From Swiss-Prot:
The keyword Ribosomal protein applies. Keywords: Ribonucleoprotein, Ribosomal protein. PROSITE patterns: RIBOSOMAL_S11. Residues 106-127 are annotated as: Disordered. Belongs to the universal ribosomal protein uS11 family. This is Small ribosomal subunit protein uS11. Residues 118-127 have a biased composition (Basic residues). HAMAP family: Ribosomal_uS11 (MF_01310). Gene3D superfamilies: Ribosomal protein S11 (3.30.420.80). It comes from Kluyveromyces lactis (strain ATCC 8585 / CBS 2359 / DSM 70799 / NBRC 1267 / NRRL Y-1140 / WM37) (Yeast).
Amino acid sequence: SQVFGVARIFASFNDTFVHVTDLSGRETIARVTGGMKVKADRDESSPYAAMLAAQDVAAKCKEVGITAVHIKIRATGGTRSKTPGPGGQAALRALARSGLRIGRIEDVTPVPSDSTRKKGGRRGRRL
RNA sequence: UUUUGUUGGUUUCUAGGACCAUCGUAAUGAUUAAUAGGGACGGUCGGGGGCAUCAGUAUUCAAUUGUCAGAGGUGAAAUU
Ligand SMILES: [Mg+2]
């Protein structure tokens, strides 16, 4: 009965994605991003924008013909953060509100075994 | 060297060297085995070293793959 997707929320700092796909992954549905719904450069990762994006994605899904999703969350990963952004949670909330159903939530952030050299240099990033 | 008369011997008796035998004598002869050290032995221990392979991969470029407005980046903010 329930037609599924995989939500894929790439929640980096300074932008969020919501990238709904089929179960194989190849054929997408909607790729809606934070910077797409709020033209302010700053307001990309910002929650409201993320929420809007999520809503848009949901709408797209509805148009297509899908009922449920599998939340996968990706923080920037590897050389950066490994910390889910400000607007992943917000996006999720938005999705929930939309009524597009939810099943099996994961964080598939690519946390390495032993990364190749990080940002900054040795003395780091000195504001 | 001392007497055989005194020189040149030769061999003694002998008294002092020295050197291999064999007989005896004696309680016949190696201090400890350092909570020093070395070394053997025994089971072990270890991200100790060398050489050899395996993973995670992770990033990147590229390949094929999909989807049409921005994604990167921000320190508050921008460029890019
Ligand atoms: Mg490069």
